[PDB]
Amino acid sequence: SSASSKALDDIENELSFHAAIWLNAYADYTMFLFELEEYNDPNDYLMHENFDFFRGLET
Amino acid sequence: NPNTEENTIDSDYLAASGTVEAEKEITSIDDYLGLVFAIAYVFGVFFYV
Amino acid sequence: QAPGNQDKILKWISTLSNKATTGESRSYCTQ
Amino acid sequence: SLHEKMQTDYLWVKDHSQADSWAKARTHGYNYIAHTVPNKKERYEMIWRSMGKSTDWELEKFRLGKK
Amino acid sequence: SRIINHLRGDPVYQDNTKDVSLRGTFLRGKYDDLPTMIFFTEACDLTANWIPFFTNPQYDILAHRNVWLLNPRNFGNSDRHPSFDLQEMSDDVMRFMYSQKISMATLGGHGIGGKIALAVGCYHAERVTGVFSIDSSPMDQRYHEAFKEFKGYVNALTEINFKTWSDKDVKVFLKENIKDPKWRSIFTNNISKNAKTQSDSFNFEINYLNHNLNFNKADSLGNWAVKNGIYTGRAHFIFPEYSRWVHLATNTLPMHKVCARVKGFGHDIFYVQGDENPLNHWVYDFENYANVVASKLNKFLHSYDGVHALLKDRTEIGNFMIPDRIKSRNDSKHIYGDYSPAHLHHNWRFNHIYEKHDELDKKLN
Amino acid sequence: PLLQRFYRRAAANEIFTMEAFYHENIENKLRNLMRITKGQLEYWDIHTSYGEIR
Amino acid sequence: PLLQRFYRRAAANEIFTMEAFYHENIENKLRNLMRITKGQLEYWDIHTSYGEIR
Amino acid sequence: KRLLEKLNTLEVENILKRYHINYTQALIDELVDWKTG
Amino acid sequence: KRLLEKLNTAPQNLEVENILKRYHINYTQALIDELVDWKTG
Numbered sequence A: 001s002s003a004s005s006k007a008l009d010d011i012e013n014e015l016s017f018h019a020a021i022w023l024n025a026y027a028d029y030t031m032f033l034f035e036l037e038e039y040n041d042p043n044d045y046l047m048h049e050n051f052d053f054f055r056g057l058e059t
Numbered sequence B: 001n002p003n004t005e006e007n008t009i010d011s012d013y014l015a016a017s018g019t020v021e022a023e024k025e026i027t028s029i030d031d032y033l034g035l036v037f038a039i040a041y042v043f044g045v046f047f048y049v
Numbered sequence C: 001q002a003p004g005n006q007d008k009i010l011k012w013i014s015t016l017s018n019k020a021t022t023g024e025s026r027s028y029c030t031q
Numbered sequence D: 001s002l003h004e005k006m007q008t009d010y011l012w013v014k015d016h017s018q019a020d021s022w023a024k025a026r027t028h029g030y031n032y033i034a035h036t037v038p039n040k041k042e043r044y045e046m047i048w049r050s051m052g053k054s055t056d057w058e059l060e061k062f063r064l065g066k067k
Numbered sequence E: 001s002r003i004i005n006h007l008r009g010d011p012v013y014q015d016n017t018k019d020v021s022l023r024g025t026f027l028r029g030k031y032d033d034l035p036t037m038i039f040f041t042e043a044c045d046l047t048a049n050w051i052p053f054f055t056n057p058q059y060d061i062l063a064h065r066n067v068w069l070l071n072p073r074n075f076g077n078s079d080r081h082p083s084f085d086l087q088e089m090s091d092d093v094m095r096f097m098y099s100q101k102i103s104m105a106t107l108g109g110h111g112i113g114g115k116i117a118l119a120v121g122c123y124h125a126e127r128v129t130g131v132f133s134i135d136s137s138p139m140d141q142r143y144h145e146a147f148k149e150f151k152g153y154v155n156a157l158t159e160i161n162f163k164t165w166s167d168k169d170v171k172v173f174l175k176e177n178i179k180d181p182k183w184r185s186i187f188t189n190n191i192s193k194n195a196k197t198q199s200d201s202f203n204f205e206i207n208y209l210n211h212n213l214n215f216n217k218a219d220s221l222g223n224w225a226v227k228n229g230i231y232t233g234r235a236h237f238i239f240p241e242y243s244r245w246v247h248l249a250t251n252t253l254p255m256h257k258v259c260a261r262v263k264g265f266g267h268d269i270f271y272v273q274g275d276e277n278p279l280n281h282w283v284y285d286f287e288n289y290a291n292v293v294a295s296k297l298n299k300f301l302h303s304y305d306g307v308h309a310l311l312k313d314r315t316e317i318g319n320f321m322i323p324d325r326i327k328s329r330n331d332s333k334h335i336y337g338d339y340s341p342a343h344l345h346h347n348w349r350f351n352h353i354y355e356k357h358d359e360l361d362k363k364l365n
Numbered sequence F, G: 001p002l003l004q005r006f007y008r009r010a011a012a013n014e015i016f017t018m019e020a021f022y023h024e025n026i027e028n029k030l031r032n033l034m035r036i037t038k039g040q041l042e043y044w045d046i047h048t049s050y051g052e053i054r
Numbered sequence H: 001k002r003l004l005e006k007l008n009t010l011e012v013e014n015i016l017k018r019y020h021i022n023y024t025q026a027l028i029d030e031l032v033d034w035k036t037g
Numbered sequence I: 001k002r003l004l005e006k007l008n009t010a011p012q013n014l015e016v017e018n019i020l021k022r023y024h025i026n027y028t029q030a031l032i033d034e035l036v037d038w039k040t041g
């Protein structure tokens, strides 16, 4: 229980960073659907207010 | 709303139908586009522009 | 002790083996 | 009734043209469009649907065909 | 067990239209205090069929509101009365809401159910937050082909006599007389055997229903009368692209004609992309149709339902001020100006949340 | 007929309809990206049980 | 306000509804007259069986 | 195949169909046995 | 009347779930609750 092995530590740290990569992507998709709840009727927003939701299009 | 206001619909699609003709390879559209506007007021008299 | 103490251990190995695609991975799964 | 056909023709006119007898020339509704009615966009959608059913949703046939 | 709770009772034939009680299934929400939703199933159609739609984690509708899957009079387990007047059938719901201590509710319906939902908002608008109608319109459908089949099938069902007819005689009768698979399955499951196996009968009143449909007059369920009036509140309509009940060409105008706040196509009226299939009426069966209805339903409940007319969305609550009409308030020393309209709690009448929060506010000061 | 102006209305009406279903179409695009993301996270769930199996 | 002309619309709009529901209103009046008629015809069904009972 | 084509022309069943879940005959047997057992 | 007025006002879930596991079929609490209610009925 204290010390497992050498090779196990190699993948213990590999699969952790691997999961952190895909947990960051899982959070991206999740937080988008969370912010998307405030967006409704794209056709009823003003031009410059819609561009503020999609920050970066003006740039 | 560019999808419900026909005034911007007509102008946006019309402008896109002209700039796309640069693929005909006449010359730099950035040069002769100003002549198109002046030439329209020669022949546009037929349409009261 | 004898009964049911190995059922969970069989699911872990089954999923681990199903994820294996290359022959080399299949070999280590058998080991 | 007995005098129905003879009388009904006497009161009103029918349309004599056979413009719709020709199939391909039948209009999809893009000639006289209603612009201000509240169902404006629902009318355009039915025009789009009719244009697609006529071409199996290959509108390249409509572009090459005669309007 | 817990999430699914349907009160149990026996239908009672009533001579007075006011002594009519409604019965149906109740689906509890995930969270403690949520507004309530009242949903009417298609005529002669089972409430259970809508359970998987409202109890799907992917949709997660119960996360928003508590659902009352309620049966109208002469349908399912609710009481029976020959009249189908939408004004009478609407008062039935108001008594149900009173007996269950519901101040105001969200109303929904499928097909003819959509009509029933909208009638309540037309007769009782101050107590309805919104309406969500699925493959229905406030319109006369007596001459729609889809209605004729239903009107025709119900008439055929009057020929069977359960006392003399055997179980096999029934199955043969349905297959030959009923061509539609779904209607056939709906009617079979509506047959029930009373206690002591005295005899089998339909859960819905076949006699009272056929007279309403066969007569084919203003009181017919296919008809929508001018007497029903106008709905003043939030309304969203969702129907298939190719639907036998609501044709996109002209059957959308009644929505503007009957619902004052309906903005139009793309805002309050949508069509689901689909093929021509007579079974598209039953969206809950096909995932593609249901996924769109649920998303649109969750959007109506979250942002549009129970929102003041002049406000765009729920986001504008507390930040958009509505203009006031002059000489509209009793106070004479009042400087007229813009105000944010009051939005109340969904059950403020049968609770004391306002009395409680008033005390907490005093403790601050 | 000279339907040039009509083609501009029909294209706007179709785009207007797509904007109305922006939420539905993008959420369907992510349901596939989440399925791929969840599939890669199945490996970390397997390694966590290795200590219990050993 | 001088609502005289409005009172003439409300009544006409109400009569418009009574005419649309003429078939239902009259059909309900006969449902009670038919009940009285069916009740009097029960005396003939009893006499037709007396010869068999005897 | 010929004779089969010529011949061609339960509460657990209904509940599962409502959820549009494909059910095998074996599963139906166990659920029925589970209730009776 | 007084007493009448006063009267007026888990394991099965696991059993069914295990069965659904063996067939690797999608299961929801609503379905399990109904099947559990179907067993009692």
Ligand SMILES: CCCCCCCCCCCCCCCCCC(=O)OC[C@H](COP(=O)([O-])OCC(O)COP(=O)([O-])OC[C@@H](COC(=O)CCCCCCCCCCCCCCCCC)OC(=O)CCCCCCCCCCCCCCCCC)OC(=O)CCCCCCCCCCCCCCCCC
Pocket: D064, D065, D066, D067, F001, F002, F003, F004
């Ligand atoms: C290659 C270019 C040729 C240009 C020739 C010169 C101008 C036209 C002369 C002929 C007049 C008839 C015109 C018919 C075509 C209409 C084209 C059109 O208007 O554009 C619509 C079109 C979009 O609208 P659409 O509704 O989709 O078009 C489909 C049609 O409406 C309808 O769709 P459709 O599919 O059903 O029709 C297809 C189209 C196919 O057309 C072709 O394929 C062209 C064929 C080759 C050219 C033949 C004409 C050559 C003329 C040169 C000789 C001229 C002699 C003059 C004197 C000497 C000249 C030096 O038309 C035909 O089918 C023609 C068949 C004729 C049937 C004849 C039956 C017998 C009738 C007998 C009585 C005739 C009386 C007529 C009354 C007088 C006419 C006004 O716009 C564009 O194409 C944009 C791109 C530009 C196209 C290239 C330029 C062509 C000229 C158009 C004007 C451009 C203006 C640019 C500015 C825009 C505003 C800012």
Ligand SMILES: CCCCCCCCCCCCCCCCCC(=O)OC[C@H](COP(=O)([O-])OCC(O)COP(=O)([O-])OC[C@@H](COC(=O)CCCCCCCCCCCCCCCCC)OC(=O)CCCCCCCCCCCCCCCCC)OC(=O)CCCCCCCCCCCCCCCCC
Pocket: G001, G002, G003, G004
């Ligand atoms: C017995 C006959 C009496 C005759 C009196 C002589 C005429 C007096 C004229 C005074 C001007 C206002 C008149 C108001 C009555 C209008 C009734 C009407 O026009 O018919 C609508 C009526 C139905 O329409 P409705 O809308 O349902 O009626 C209710 C009202 O709309 C609204 O309903 P409501 O419930 O709100 O009101 C009930 C109605 C009850 O009326 C009565 O019971 C009559 C009681 C006796 C007369 C009391 C008012 C006398 C005028 C006082 C003026 C005070 C000036 C102070 C000046 C101070 C500054 C120096 O009006 C009143 O209560 C009057 C109270 C006055 C309070 C004043 C408050 C302070 C204002 C101070 C500002 C001063 C500005 C003055 C500028 C000039 C005036 C604009 O039609 C009929 O019923 C037909 C039967 C007619 C009855 C007999 C004839 C009576 C005369 C009516 C005109 C001729 C009708 C036939 C025409 C044929 C054409 C084909």
